[PDB]
């Protein structure tokens, strides 16, 4: 089948791993493989969980930040650029993700993340690696985004 290399990046402690492990081992709390079918087509999801050369390899990127951590939100630009850099491209498959949407201590409005997503041209999705909510839309959207290449 077809193979996809997804790279999850983000401010430390935002839930990069929680998400990854939620998709691979279906539960709430590095290399990961996974056979899955998306929109019919069958494919291999190669997920590389990184820390809060190997990025020139990834095909699609998951820029994550927690909605209860303003700085993690302000740091997206930093990673976005570091990516945009090591891949001489102004548009690289990628999705902005606001994790921990299960909390009430929210310091980042959605209206805030959306504006930033539009200025980028990438999709924005909120996920909770705890209630597993959105954990799939996020990853599958990133794939559909890579199929546009
Ligand atoms: N309530 C809630 N907490 C979450 C969620 N995702 C992560 N956590 C919790 O917050 C902590 C950080 O999650 P973790 O995935 O380890 O963060 P990280 O992005 O991997 N940080 P690191 O840079 O150290 O690798 C853990 O205790 C985890 O259980 C979520 O969706 N909701
Ligand atoms: Mg981690």
From Swiss-Prot:
User: Where is this gene product found?
Assistant: Cell membrane; Golgi apparatus; Golgi apparatus membrane
Q: What is its EC number?
A: 3.6.5.2
Per its UniProt entry, what is the enzyme's top EC class, as one word?
Answer: hydrolase
N-acetylthreonine: which positions carry it? 2
Task: Tell me which residues bind GTP.
Answer: 13-18, 51-52, 99-102, 128-130
The record's listing under SUPFAM superfamilies reads: P-loop containing nucleoside triphosphate hydrolases
| Top-rank taxon | Eukaryota
Q: Name one GO molecular function term.
A: G protein activity
Effect of substituting residue 12 to S: In CSTLO and CMEMS; also found in patients with oral squamous cell carcinoma
Effect of altering residue 26 to G?
Loss of interaction with PLCE1
Q: In which tissues is it expressed?
A: Widely expressed.
Q: How is its activity regulated?
A: Alternates between an inactive form bound to GDP and an active form bound to GTP. Activated by a guanine nucleotide-exchange factor (GEF) and inactivated by a GTPase-activating protein (GAP).
Tell me, what is an example of a GO biological process annotation in this record?
Answer: myelination
Note the CDD domains from the entry.
Answer: H_N_K_Ras_like
**What protein family does this chain belong to?**
Belongs to the small GTPase superfamily. Ras family.
Describe its partners and assembly state: In its GTP-bound form interacts with PLCE1. Interacts with TBC1D10C. Interacts with RGL3. Interacts with HSPD1. Found in a complex with at least BRAF, HRAS, MAP2K1, MAPK3 and RGS14. Interacts (active GTP-bound form) with RGS14 (via RBD 1 domain). Forms a signaling complex with RASGRP1 and DGKZ. Interacts with RASSF5. Interacts with PDE6D. Interacts with IKZF3. Interacts with RACK1. Interacts with PIK3CG; the interaction is required for membrane recruitment and beta-gamma G protein dimer-dependent activation of the PI3K gamma complex PIK3CG:PIK3R6. Interacts with RAPGEF2.
**What is this protein identified as?**
GTPase HRas
- Which species does the entry assign this protein to? Homo sapiens (Human)
Q: Which gene encodes it?
A: HRAS
